[PDB]
Amino acid sequence: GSSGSSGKPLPINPDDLYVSVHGMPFSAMENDVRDFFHGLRVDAVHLLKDHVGRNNGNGLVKFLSPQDTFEALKRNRMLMIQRYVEVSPATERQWVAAGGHITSGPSS
């Protein structure tokens, strides 16, 4: 194998802070989520539902700092309430479409 390392100095990208979790019980709720990421800086937690307003098994998490989320990525494909969760980075676009909300810069 072989590969080069060509990167640039850029500021923390939201994509990181914004991750998605697929594979949660039908009863899983804002609370249950905590149990998983209980101990890290939690800012907000988005949960997707279906027509029957039921937690199928997909949501998004937004952490203030990245150093925190980085940990969640390590808890990907873990055991949760007899259900496998899929922790993977997300894109601002998804966060919006899904039904999120953030304050750009509340100015007078």
Task: Please tell me the total count of domains within the chain.
Answer: 1
Q: Exposed e or buried b for every residue in 63-72, given b needs 16+ CB within 10 A?
A: beeeebbeeb
Technique used by the depositors: NMR
Residue 81 lies in a domain: yes
The contacts of residue 87 (CB under 8 Å, 6+ apart) are 19, 20, 21, 72, 73, 75, 76, 77, 78
* CATH number (domain holding residue 32): 3.30.70.330
Task: State the DSSP code for 93.
Answer: H
Residue 8 lies in a domain: no
Q: Is the dihedral of CA 74, 72, 96, 91 positive or negative?
A: negative
Structural domain harbouring 27: 13-94
